[PDB]
Amino acid sequence: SLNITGIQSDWKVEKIEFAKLTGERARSAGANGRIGVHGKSCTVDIARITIDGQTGYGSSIHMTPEWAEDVIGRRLLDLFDDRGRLREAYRLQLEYPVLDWLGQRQGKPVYDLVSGAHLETGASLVVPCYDTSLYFDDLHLADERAAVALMQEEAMQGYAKGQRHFKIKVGRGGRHMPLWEGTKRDIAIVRGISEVAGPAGKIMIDANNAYNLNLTKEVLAALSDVNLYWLEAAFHEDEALYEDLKEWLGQRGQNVLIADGEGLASPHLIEWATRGRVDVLQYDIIWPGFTHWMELGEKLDAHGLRSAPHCYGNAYGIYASGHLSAAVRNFEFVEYDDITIEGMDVSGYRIENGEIHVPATPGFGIVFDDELVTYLINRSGWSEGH
Ligand SMILES: [Mg+2]
Ligand SMILES: [Mg+2]
């Protein structure tokens, strides 16, 4: 659904440059259900592409100097297929710098270039978001009251910044705490954060597969008074288990969506979703990526299914995810982590009242510090072309 009618055939890839940018998230992220402390440090691998004397920037992965050497000289148009879709071989390495480039050259935000029927030209793009940063930051505290207070204060930091919806890590009893104790702590923490967000705040819980079906049912029942919007990764996806869970929720009149799709997903997950076992699909916004998601999102829309791309671990993906919502009707939320990357100015985006306002400026609306990136390319990155 990309508009590529205005791409001249004389337009060629002149130069490809690469650098890793670094920074930090606002608050160090602790453990989750399956692994240890995530930390405070953040990076974003970036490529700067030069086509017809103009540059575009974006996320770039799986690219080597040798790989990029072979792309120099090519016509932009030959990277696309007739259908208007960037070819598979170029997506992970180049889709973002290319889309940004196209927006810069055409003077349009990417969302305008990939817009679908549900967003009419000229209207501001405002997308729902949630605060994804509520990890197991309480583990060093033995006292439940203190643990709840600490997690409430973390949610409040988000609320103070304009967040209204919160995704809370649960599954403490899977690995990090004794089973029963950790499960009681999960419940106390979720109720606690519920009180910060208030009755209109959507609460998501993510167990990172630390539960089984019966632990999940115990937790859902305990939280029947919380405004639980969705349950994510209760346990590794399994059609029989989710069918059972959906029937149990149905009998209770408990309206909680099932979300899944991150990491090494079941190859049949979308099929299970079309049969009604899973409601929200969560493939990563970087890999498989944006071009993949535009196609997938249309398919899911047709099936009446929901999209919520995963973004954790790459600040750039937050902003990409925002633009993707213009192409996907049943887009749910931007997964938001508060991160400062040196040289990557995202002040064009704003969080207000549980939504992220996407700027109407060209490409992805992110302003990279050209001189800093030039320095980093020299210092530790690389360059192909001239
Ligand atoms: Mg998750
Ligand atoms: Mg899963």
Side-chain angles (χ1 to χ4, degrees), residues 209 233 236-237 260-262:
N209 295 334
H236 187 68
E237 53 263 26
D260 217 321
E262 297 163 335

Side-chain angles (χ1 to χ4, degrees), residues 136-192:
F136 294 176
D137 305 308
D138 58 305
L139 293 180
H140 65 290
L141 297 169
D143 178 37
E144 172 186 284
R145 296 185 63 264
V148 170
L150 180 149
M151 295 304 302
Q152 279 179 316
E153 148 69 358
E154 296 194 342
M156 187 70 71
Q157 298 170 16
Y159 194 97
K161 294 174 195 174
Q163 301 289 339
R164 297 295 180 264
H165 313 300
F166 299 87
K167 184 160 88 190
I168 307 170
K169 294 303 192 231
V170 297
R172 281 165 179 74
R175 170 176 189 195
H176 297 293
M177 291 179 72
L179 184 58
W180 183 212
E181 196 188 334
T183 299
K184 294 198 90 75
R185 176 82 66 92
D186 286 342
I187 291 159
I189 287 167
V190 174
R191 298 195 174 126

Side-chain angles (χ1 to χ4, degrees), residues 263-284:
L264 308 160
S266 163
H268 309 123
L269 175 57
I270 293 162
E271 190 178 338
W272 303 344
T274 69
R275 290 198 280 274
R277 287 63 153 107
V278 172
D279 308 293
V280 178
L281 285 305
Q282 300 185 298
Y283 304 96
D284 188 75

